[PDB]
Paper text:
Removal of the first four residues (Met-His-Asn-Asp) of MsbA abolished binding of copper(II), pinning down the metal binding site to the N-terminus. To facilitate structure determination, the N-terminal sequence of MsbA was grafted onto proteins known to readily crystallize. One of the green fluorescent protein (GFP) fusions, containing residues 1-4 of MsbA, produced X-ray-grade crystals that led to structure determination at 2.15 Å resolution. Resolved electron density for the N-terminus is observed along with strong anomalous signal for the bound copper ion and adopts a structure of similar to that for the copper(II) coordinated GHK peptide, a naturally occurring high-affinity copper(II) chelator found in the blood plasma. The copper(II) adopts a pseudo-octahedral coordination with the planar ligands comprised of the amine of M1, amide and sidechain of H2. An additional interaction is formed by the sidechain of D197’ from a symmetry related molecule and similar to the GHK-copper(II) structure, wherein is a C-terminal carboxylate. The axial ligands of copper(II) are water, one of which forms a bridge between copper and the sidechain and amide of N3. This interaction represents a crystal contact and coordination differs from the GHK peptide in the axial waters and N3 participating in a water bridge to the metal ion. The difference between the two structures suggests the third position can be variable. Given the proximity of the N-terminus to the inner leaflet, the copper(II) bound structure could engage lipid headgroup, resulting in enhanced lipid binding affinity.
Residue numbers in the entry: 1 to 66, 70 to 239
Write the structure that this text describes.
């Protein structure tokens, strides 16, 4: 059913739970988020809170770690949606995020259905960060730019890889690059969809809840797949 069970589990609005256990340079922390995704429109709304007090890193640095199965894949690209096709058993998402002239994150997440909730459970380990870098020094603006996520099928596994560079606005007007390497593997055993080269086009809006005492991030996200044109002449 991997050609169809995918889209079907994501019609309408699906609730989301995110759980992050982080350790950056020995500083442990935890984030919980909840909200909902509308895959048909490629729309996510979530609120994350740091449950261990203050967040030891800027919230923007955690955005990409904190559910690409909610992408809007156009109809002519539906057979390239690996993320949904691995559902409900889900997929493992692993990243290496290298911050230029600073430390690196390594992340391992399981993204899967638990009941009617889409869950993203993550472990994050950061090392080699500078005590007064842009990351541990909290020098990054509280905003987020739009990016493409370039996806390719695994050469030999039934998974995908992705590569992209996040651009973090630094509060002195400069830019902090966060190079992303990404690997996704199905948790289950059945077939999945393996995509042609394509990308996820992603846009994010960060805000704050004015009635929120805890360290927190409110996030609205839009994500749609693009870059494959086969099957489209009739639309013009
Ligand atoms: Cu199938």
């Amino acid at each position: 059913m991997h050609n169809d069970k995918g889209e079907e589990l994501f019609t309408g609005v699906v609730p989301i739970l995110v759980e992050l256990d982080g350790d950056v340079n020995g500083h442990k922390f935890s984030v919980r988020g909840e909200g909902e995704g509308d895959a048909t429109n490629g729309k996510l709304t979530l609120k994350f809170i740091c449950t261990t007090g203050k967040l030891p890193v800027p919230w923007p640095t955690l955005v990409t770690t904190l559910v690409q199965c909610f992408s809007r894949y156009p109809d002519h690209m539906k057979q390239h949606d690996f993320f949904k096709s691995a559902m409900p058993e889900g997929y493992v998402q692993e990243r290496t995020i290298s911050f230029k002239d600073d430390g690196t994150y390594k992340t391992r997440a399981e993204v899967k259905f638990e009941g009617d909730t889409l869950v993203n459970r993550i472990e994050l380990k950061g090392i080699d960060f500078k005590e007064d870098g842009n990351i541990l020094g909290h020098e990054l603006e509280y905003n987020f730019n739009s990016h493409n996520v370039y996806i390719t099928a695994d050469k030999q596994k039934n998974g995908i890889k992705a590569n992209f560079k996040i651009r973090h606005n630094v509060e002195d007007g400069s830019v902090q690059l966060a190079d992303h390497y990404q690997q996704n593997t199905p948790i289950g055993d059945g077939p999945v969809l393996l995509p042609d080269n394509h990308y996820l086009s992603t846009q994010s809006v960060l805000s704050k809840d004015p009635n929120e005492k805890r360290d927190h991030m409110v996030l609205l996200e839009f994500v749609t797949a693009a870059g494959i044109t086969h099957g489209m002449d009739e639309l013009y």
